[PDB]
């Protein structure tokens, strides 16, 4: 017999996807749109990485490599978590994947049985429940308040806590808040974990990213407890790499390399070559992330002081390149809110995929001259 | 609770990794071991594939991609399986995966519900079995013989299809027996799962490694019910760039992208924009295939004699870069055999992995020195 199985059909289909489909038929027919869209950064990837990549090509380091990738790479790995993070952990206790979805997607894999909740939060990167959904696992859904700063409660968590709880999923900072979590609730998240015996998986891709604050690893207190899931995406603007990494307990980290030996056997060689070289160069590397870091900054404090005068809502974020506008001044709902904003020469991203209703996700990895092109449109629907 | 899921712990072990670790202990205690296991390509990749993705890196090309692949990239593969394997298709119908491996990982994810059978024939490639059973799915074995040139007889297959069967895996040119399947068995095959209304997996990444007779994509026949599975890695040497491609029914490719969505998001961008070229420049391309497959072929000859002349059995392959090769004048079973090679010098496959006991395969994807080498080592095992 043929057709489809069961879990490919149950997925849901994405509201980001029909605005956009909007936002090409109004390019087609000349529409000048402004898109603060972004779900990666602006600037390319830095020589040092590039010049990496082109070294190995010359080597001829063509073949495959290892399913938790080369040795070499899982060492400099085990260097930046103690040195950057404060984990303590060995070269096996690392992983090499096609980007941090694929270690997000092998981890579900491994250790979640048809059944197994997840607790998430909620506003939430799209990809978490879709993940979560497609290894047969619950989804728990724990709401973040906009007047909290979306920073989450730990009493609303205790209450999502029951028998079956076999996952907590934090990312901080945020992604589509920009929220940073004090290291204080952190530490009452692992502290959960320990006592229920549950996982705490903690997605930290926007370390680097940060502008005030500091970025607290929750595997320092819970090492046993915690998979940390990271990499180069973000940080080092390669996206287009798919070079993501993790680390954690010994057994876990192992089944996750059987699932990507039985999948993709192992991530693009020549990229793993050039990730090495931005883990080992501190200095070419330390020199991009602070001229991004200042970029952004300026970038977030043009728009939220417009945001401001135009008596739009937003939260202040501390981390990441992304804000959650308050819409209601705009349309009843944020679908309809972002319909206008595309009418206007705005691209916005709906909050409705990241569960964060009545908001629209605006990122800020474009230049200045955008941002205030931007600003100007919303005055003129306002 | 704590633990791995059921799926992960399912995966059984191997008996490369149990005699890997005899040969890792002899290299280390400083023996000199000639080495036959390899199963990719001993060239490096052409440089125009690699001038491809030099110009990608000064362009900026490193951001994220569509998960399908690149719009360049999936038109040049409807061209592709046009004018080489006669399918109809359409960019649509076509997608881009990191790895053959993950063509396939994603397809079984994609039709397979825990129960649905999956008929693979014996001698096979490790990974289906694997892959199957990930998905949930039970694993139906059709043997196939060595007085038959390993060649499936489609009456033996008849007989293993019920009501739940969901699939048939056929790979042409083979992998670990080198056989090639001629077009009317593979006309019989397809017919069947036309009559009985199922898919038909057809892996063809060695149809360009041929030596005698001609390559059928059985997908002419029977296209709604052919998925064909195909890449990069073994004709162009990229097997590290982990660029791999399918073509058949549109709502499976559309199920598939969906699947890499979740997971792997897409293929690393650079490694597409090179695939690219590998493709069009077909000037450059076939010179390479050509070069390459002339080399094999001198190989496998030189390898036949030897073996003839040491009065070893093994049947004559005519695709791939593989022989197996009867254990029976060395030792009772096949792991025994590869020890007692280890110790003579010669680090070979063992074929207990591919159900092809008694066997043992050989790579001939080294240098003719080498093979010599070898083929010296083997007369103190007899
Ligand atoms: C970008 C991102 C990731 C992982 O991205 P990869 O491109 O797959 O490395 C994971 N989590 C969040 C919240 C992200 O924004
Ligand atoms: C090598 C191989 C593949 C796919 O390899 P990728 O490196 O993932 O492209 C598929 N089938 C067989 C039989 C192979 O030998």
């Known amino acids: 017999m043929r057709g489809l199985s069961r879990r490919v059909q149950a997925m849901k289909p994405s509201a980001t996807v029909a605005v956009n489909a909007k936002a090409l038929e109004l390019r087609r027919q000349g529409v000048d749109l402004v898109a603060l869209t972004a779900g990666e950064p602006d600037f390319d990837t830095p020589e040092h990485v590039k010049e990496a990549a082109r070294r190995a090509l010359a080597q001829g380091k063509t073949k495959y490599a290892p399913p938790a990738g080369i040795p070499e790479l899982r060492e400099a790995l085990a260097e930046k978590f103690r040195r950057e993070n404060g984990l303590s952990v060995t070269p096996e206790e690392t992983i090499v994947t096609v980007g ?79 929220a940073v979590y004090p290291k204080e609730v952190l530490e009452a998240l692992a502290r959960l974990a320990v006592e229920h015996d549950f996982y705490l998986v903690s997605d930290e891709i926007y370390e680097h990213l940060l502008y005030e604050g500091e970025h607290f690893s929750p595997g320092r207190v819970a090492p046993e407890h915690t998979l940390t899931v990271n990499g180069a995406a973000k940080a080092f603007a390669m996206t287009g790499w798919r070079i993501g990494y993790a680390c954690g307990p010994k057994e876990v980290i192992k089944a996750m390399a059987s699932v ?51 008596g739009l809502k937003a939260v202040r974020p501390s981390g990441a390149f992304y804000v959650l506008m308050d819409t209601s001044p705009i349309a009843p709902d944020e679908v309809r809110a972002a319909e206008r904003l595309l009418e206007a020469g705005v691209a916005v991203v709906p909050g409705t995929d990241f569960a964060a209703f009545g908001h629209v996700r605006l990122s800020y990895a474009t230049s200045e001259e955008n941002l205030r092109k931007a600003l100007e449109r919303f005055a003129r629907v306002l």
Chains 1, 2 share one sequence.
Do not use: C, H
């Open 100 to 178: 941090g979805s694929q270690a997000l997607f092998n981890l579900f894999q491994a250790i979640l049985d048809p059944g197994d909740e997840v607790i998430v939060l909620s506003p939430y990167w799209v990809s978490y429940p879709e993940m979560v959904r497609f290894a047969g696992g619950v989804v728990v859904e724990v709401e973040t308040l906009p007047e909290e700063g979306f920073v989450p409660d730990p009493e609303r968590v205790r209450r999502a806590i029951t028998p079956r709880t076999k996952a907590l999923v934090v990312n901080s900072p945020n992604n589509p808040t920009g």
């Open 260 to 310: 990507s030996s039985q999948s993709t056997t192992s991530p693009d060689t020549i990229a793993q070559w050039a990730t090495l070289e931005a883990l080992t160069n501190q200095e070419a590397s330390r020199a991009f992330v602070e001229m991004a870091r200042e970029a952004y900054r300026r970038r977030r404090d043009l728009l939220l002081e417009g945001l401001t005068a135009l």
